[PDB]
Amino acid sequence: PEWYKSAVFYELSVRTFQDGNGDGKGDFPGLTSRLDYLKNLGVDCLWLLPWFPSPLRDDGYDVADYRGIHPDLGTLDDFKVFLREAHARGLWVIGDLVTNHTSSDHPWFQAARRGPTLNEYHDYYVWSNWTLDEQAGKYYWHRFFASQPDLNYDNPKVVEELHGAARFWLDLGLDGFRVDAVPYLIEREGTSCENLPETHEILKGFRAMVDREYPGRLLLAEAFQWPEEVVEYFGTEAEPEFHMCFNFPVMPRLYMSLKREDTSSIREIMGRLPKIPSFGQWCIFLRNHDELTLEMVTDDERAFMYAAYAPDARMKINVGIRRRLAPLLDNDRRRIELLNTVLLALPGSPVLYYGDEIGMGDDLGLPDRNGVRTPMQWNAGTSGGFSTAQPSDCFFPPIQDPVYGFGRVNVQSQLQDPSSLLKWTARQLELRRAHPAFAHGDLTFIETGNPAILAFTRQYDGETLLIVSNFAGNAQAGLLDLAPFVGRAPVTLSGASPLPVVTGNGQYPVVMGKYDYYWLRLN
Amino acid sequence: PEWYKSAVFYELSVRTFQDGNGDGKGDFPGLTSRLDYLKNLGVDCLWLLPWFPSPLRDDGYDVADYRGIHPDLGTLDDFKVFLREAHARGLWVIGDLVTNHTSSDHPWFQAARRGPTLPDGSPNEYHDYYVWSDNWTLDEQAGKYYWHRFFASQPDLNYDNPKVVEELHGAARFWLDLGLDGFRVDAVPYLIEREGTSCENLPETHEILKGFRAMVDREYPGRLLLAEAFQWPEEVVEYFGTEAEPEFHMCFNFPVMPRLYMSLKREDTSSIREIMGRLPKIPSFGQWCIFLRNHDELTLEMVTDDERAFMYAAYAPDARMKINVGIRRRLAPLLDNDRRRIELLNTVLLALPGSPVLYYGDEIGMGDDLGLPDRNGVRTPMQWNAGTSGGFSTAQPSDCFFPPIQDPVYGFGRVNVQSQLQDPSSLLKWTARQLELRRAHPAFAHGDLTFIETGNPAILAFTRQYDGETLLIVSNFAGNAQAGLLDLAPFVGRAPVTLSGASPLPVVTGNGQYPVVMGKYDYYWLRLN
Numbered sequence A: 001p002e003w004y005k006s007a008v009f010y011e012l013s014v015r016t017f018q019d020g021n022g023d024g025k026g027d028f029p030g031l032t033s034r035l036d037y038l039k040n041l042g043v044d045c046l047w048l049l050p051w052f053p054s055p056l057r058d059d060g061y062d063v064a065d066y067r068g069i070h071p072d073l074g075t076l077d078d079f080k081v082f083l084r085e086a087h088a089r090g091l092w093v094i095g096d097l098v099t100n101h102t103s104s105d106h107p108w109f110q111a112a113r114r115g116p117t118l119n120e121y122h123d124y125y126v127w128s129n130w131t132l133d134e135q136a137g138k139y140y141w142h143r144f145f146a147s148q149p150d151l152n153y154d155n156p157k158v159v160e161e162l163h164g165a166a167r168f169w170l171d172l173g174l175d176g177f178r179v180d181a182v183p184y185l186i187e188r189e190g191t192s193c194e195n196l197p198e199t200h201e202i203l204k205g206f207r208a209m210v211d212r213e214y215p216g217r218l219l220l221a222e223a224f225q226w227p228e229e230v231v232e233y234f235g236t237e238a239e240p241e242f243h244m245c246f247n248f249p250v251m252p253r254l255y256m257s258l259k260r261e262d263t264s265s266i267r268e269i270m271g272r273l274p275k276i277p278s279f280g281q282w283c284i285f286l287r288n289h290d291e292l293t294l295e296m297v298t299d300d301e302r303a304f305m306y307a308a309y310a311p312d313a314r315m316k317i318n319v320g321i322r323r324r325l326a327p328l329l330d331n332d333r334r335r336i337e338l339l340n341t342v343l344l345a346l347p348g349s350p351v352l353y354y355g356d357e358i359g360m361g362d363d364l365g366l367p368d369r370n371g372v373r374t375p376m377q378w379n380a381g382t383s384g385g386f387s388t389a390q391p392s393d394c395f396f397p398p399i400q401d402p403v404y405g406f407g408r409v410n411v412q413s414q415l416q417d418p419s420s421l422l423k424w425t426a427r428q429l430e431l432r433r434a435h436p437a438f439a440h441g442d443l444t445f446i447e448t449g450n451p452a453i454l455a456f457t458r459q460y461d462g463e464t465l466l467i468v469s470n471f472a473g474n475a476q477a478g479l480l481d482l483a484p485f486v487g488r489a490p491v492t493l494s495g496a497s498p499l500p501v502v503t504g505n506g507q508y509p510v511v512m513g514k515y516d517y518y519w520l521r522l523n
Numbered sequence B: 001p002e003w004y005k006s007a008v009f010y011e012l013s014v015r016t017f018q019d020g021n022g023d024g025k026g027d028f029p030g031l032t033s034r035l036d037y038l039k040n041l042g043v044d045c046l047w048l049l050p051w052f053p054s055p056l057r058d059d060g061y062d063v064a065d066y067r068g069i070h071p072d073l074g075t076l077d078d079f080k081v082f083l084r085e086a087h088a089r090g091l092w093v094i095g096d097l098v099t100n101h102t103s104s105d106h107p108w109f110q111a112a113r114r115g116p117t118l119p120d121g122s123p124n125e126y127h128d129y130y131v132w133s134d135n136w137t138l139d140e141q142a143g144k145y146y147w148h149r150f151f152a153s154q155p156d157l158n159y160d161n162p163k164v165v166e167e168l169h170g171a172a173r174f175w176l177d178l179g180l181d182g183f184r185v186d187a188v189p190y191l192i193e194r195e196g197t198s199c200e201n202l203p204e205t206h207e208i209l210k211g212f213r214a215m216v217d218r219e220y221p222g223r224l225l226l227a228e229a230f231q232w233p234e235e236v237v238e239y240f241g242t243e244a245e246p247e248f249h250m251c252f253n254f255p256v257m258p259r260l261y262m263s264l265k266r267e268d269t270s271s272i273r274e275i276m277g278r279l280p281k282i283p284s285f286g287q288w289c290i291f292l293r294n295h296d297e298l299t300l301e302m303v304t305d306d307e308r309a310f311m312y313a314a315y316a317p318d319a320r321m322k323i324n325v326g327i328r329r330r331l332a333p334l335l336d337n338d339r340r341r342i343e344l345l346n347t348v349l350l351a352l353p354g355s356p357v358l359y360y361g362d363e364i365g366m367g368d369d370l371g372l373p374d375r376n377g378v379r380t381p382m383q384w385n386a387g388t389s390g391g392f393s394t395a396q397p398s399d400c401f402f403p404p405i406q407d408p409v410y411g412f413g414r415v416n417v418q419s420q421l422q423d424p425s426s427l428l429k430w431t432a433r434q435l436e437l438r439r440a441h442p443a444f445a446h447g448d449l450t451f452i453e454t455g456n457p458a459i460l461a462f463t464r465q466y467d468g469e470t471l472l473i474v475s476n477f478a479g480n481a482q483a484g485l486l487d488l489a490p491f492v493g494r495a496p497v498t499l500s501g502a503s504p505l506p507v508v509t510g511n512g513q514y515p516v517v518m519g520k521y522d523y524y525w526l527r528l529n
Ligand SMILES: [Ca+2]
Pocket: B100, B156, B157, B158, B159, B190, B191, B192, B193
């Protein structure tokens, strides 16, 4: 019933998507001009990166106004037109609500740093991972960066200031937030300072507030933890909290399984997913604005990944690999389609990262995770059509290498190419939309004779989908245990071509080509 | 065995491959400068299109000198060095030998046009080089009709004159002595003409060809004579001659080609194994020559009228796309630029019995330019890089013999050699690697061909056997997953294994009916162990 359960999401950064005014930086007007593209792509909801005023010491997650638009993205009017036009086209939109902290440049903090009195803004933050404030002559607490002062959530004027910020955007029409850094909200003495029941209480209320005043809207938990730990942040039926949390550990295991030609680890994570509230939905993805993280893997698995996908030391950062999906898969369209299909056929709402629909590469010449944040590539024009501004003058430079450059990889080409990745992606999303079991159906892995072949069913409302996916780079054989479905014919979702009916014991033999995916219905 | 049997051929036009001097026209120096690319690609023999002096009224098949290089392609020296450099790299080269006629600009004919007698008195030996009388065009000079099968500027040579049969031998020898490895011999069915006869395949031409073949066997062993002769296989086999009296080493298997495309649209591979299965037997020395595309339109001459209409509807939706009795489009556009279909037809071409000819540019996925008149849209310049004219010339695009393609889909900015050399998954590297697989397995080149029963016409399956190697090749022609039950009864106890990773599949058992599923357009290349 709820929209976010069946939504395909699409993550972009306004600053990097389309420059509307020639200054080299993406902006809302420019984004507005590309809404038809996003519409026709088949995406349902745009998740925009932080659009708020900031000195950008932590990519604008250090917020210095919660009710503003960063000046070089346009104005609050631009934002309103963007949302009107987005909605006119059947698109939901969400943003990033940074709950735990602000930038040091927030008025609140500039007021707070002036002793206890001259001052109601002193007790918004936590005073005496502590830094000496020159002005106030005290230490302040910061969970994350010295320039990111953690908020005092024990002061309930702050809990209102949060609720207020949320309303500001929800009033304007915004369909949800991805809610950041929520585990670190309250802090006790001699304890974890994460996942504390008091912090959960605030979220339960925050939820119950939007449930009441703004039904339909979406709260999505950015909270980097295993499923078995974030289930907490869904709350309960009686006390709901977040509608959606991410399922992180699938992600690296898709890549790992491709290179191991062994899909065991996918089953291990997916099949052992905990139960969730009836209103809840998992959120999954292949790539995003950060590196491909390897935190939720063994050390030996992490070492395998590095050998497999980061041959160049430059490719490593933090605890992961800072490369785009296409370069990771050696620009192999077969592997690109494969993982995308598997992503789309698993339970959860998938998030697609801007540019991956057309096969974008990365720029390791750029510091610190910026190589996967280059400008979108629209045509073979001057800066990939991203700006009339020359490449040197764009926020990040548009990619021009012989393989992934905008002269070869761009939206216009793939709009005109009958067999482009772009059009493929759009069709596949359409296929997914035509079958509710993808979004709401259950998940049952099935026996293949072969770890390289992953097979599973998705069941809902008397529809049964059979998804078979070869993770090997050559022909594989399987014996699918389809005993439950004897007397049924697996039929091709694309084109309704029927396969042999399951008979006898229902051990169904198959061969598959390299990286093939079979999207089948059972009836 | 002989080299031509296991050879992969590569058809190029010197005038459009590489410009070496900035004039906007391809040439030998330019061609010579790209030999490494061709060597590394994994092709064996280059077939160069007509390179002779000519007024180009018939794309250079109207020859005006058999012992010359066309002035805007270089000099005869350029040619010799090209050939030396080609051989040093392990490449065989062949050229077109147009036997049946010359251009009207050929001095032989400019001499013959002066009647049987010269003005000083001398007897005009050159007059009896061509066929005169009283398809016939009147000459304002000689005051007589001359026989021409093809164009009024393509006067048929008179092959009853034994001086002419020598001129042919002479022309052949000139090139052979320079070291040329063979000819595609053009328009040979139409050599000799009689009364109340077809004027085609007359056993007198076969005499000249047996002679011509005897000449080359004796004086130049190893060289290749390939018959350009546009006929059905049962009818061309004549041109191989017999074991005792040979003629051509190779003939073209024309009908497979349109059927490959047709079967893909129909998702029915019947016509393929019909034609491939009812092929006539050929001499020990003989070999079939097979291909997907070439310098011409995709001809639909050797199919039924209904089959032709079907092909036009499927593959020439726009009327621009039609010409003569075919479709003037490149392979990649034909297949909607779908890499899966491109790889598939190529795999099948490479896996069938015959020596495959590959058309230049297809290895990178080049498109066509239908705004160019008359077949010129599939003869656009090779695309080397994203430089000024695809790297084909420093001359700007509009100054090139034909303009390099620049559309968003197939333009040289997106489709070019340099990009695909750096792309781990490019069509170029795919093509290179796939030839390596074919090279590594002699059953492809030399083995026999047995079709296998699948329960499903969309799944084409066959074996190739030679020297105790047995290859199973399974190919889905459908746009989606397809099931088959392969009759592998003979190979019970054998496990089919992957040519690529040496991945073994389930061992064949019982009755040997082997079930399979295939993805859209998949191809399985297997060894039976
Ligand atoms: Ca003749």
